[PDB]
């Protein structure tokens, strides 16, 4: 009952923890040519030399 | 001079003899607390039974 | 449309009539703050005692806003 | 080497020959698209119920690419 | 004694683990306008247009 | 105060005097070199096997490296 009440949830809210932060590297990473894009479109108001 | 002068108008179009002081803007932020939970299995009990 | 062109032979130029529009006379400033959403480091051990992200990302802000800092004179 | 120098003191002026040219005389334009690879937020707790990283993250974008919405007009 | 001297040491080094992570992106997050800021003056040197 | 300011209605104009001045009239080169801190991939399985970071924030690094590798000709 300490295994499946205590410890258990706790590693399963860790494994969905990981999850996310994998996630949102994956999304900072996958979209990086998007992101750089919309900053400097950002940082000149829309229009890039 | 622009001590005495902040404006001159000169017919329908106004000059602006001195840089005209503008509403303070403030973007508060507060200290993010990270927060865990350590887990502590209760031995002492558990070794006596 | 309101923009057209003229065009002169006498001269041989071009004109485009037809804009409104906005002198600079001045300039309206106007004091922007903000403030920082401070992390306190959380001691106690992770998997790697070797690695302190928490410290080595305040450090690398701390130093780009003493970087900054030395720029004023 | 292809390019040199000339000096005239005639007129106490210098050219610089030997430049062969390309003179801009138009333009091409092209659209290109992006697509987001969007993210769906997964649903079960974390080690800390109080954050949500992917939401938080989405409205990072989200509130960016609505600011620029509003550049256009 | 296994579950208590040896995995739950590692559990809690991964609790802590992934609140210093959670937190190192939750800064690049809360002040993710002030990062940008910050990062464009240092490019431009004070001054930005 | 040092900077002032003259008005001459003779010519109708306005001279600023008092400004100590620098004229460049050269350049001052350097090499700068960085090196890269890189990382080796860790071999072993994580919570989702589909998902490499280190691989793949590698080749976001390696692909932008080249993107500027053939910018210099």
Request: hydrophobic share 35%; charged share 20%.
């Amino acid at each position: 009952n300490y295994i499946d009440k205590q410890l258990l949830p706790i590693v399963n809210k860790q494994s969905c923890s990981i999850s996310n932060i994998e996630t949102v590297i994956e999304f900072q990473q996958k979209n990086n040519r998007l992101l750089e894009i919309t900053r400097e479109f950002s940082v000149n108001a829309g229009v890039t030399t | 001079s622009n001590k005495g002068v902040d404006t001159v108008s000169v017919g329908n179009t106004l000059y602006y003899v001195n840089k005209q002081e503008g509403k303070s803007l403030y973007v508060k932020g507060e200290p993010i607390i990270n927060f865990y939970d350590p887990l502590v299995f209760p031995s002492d009990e558990f070794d006596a039974s | 449309q309101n923009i057209t062109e003229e065009f002169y032979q006498s001269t041989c130029s071009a004109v485009s009539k037809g804009y409104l529009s906005a002198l600079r006379t001045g300039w309206y400033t106007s004091v922007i703050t903000i403030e920082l959403s401070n992390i306190k480091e959380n001691k106690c051990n992770g998997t790697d005692a070797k690695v302190k992200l928490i410290k080595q990302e305040l450090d690398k802000y701390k130093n780009a806003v003493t970087e900054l800092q030395l720029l004023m004179q």
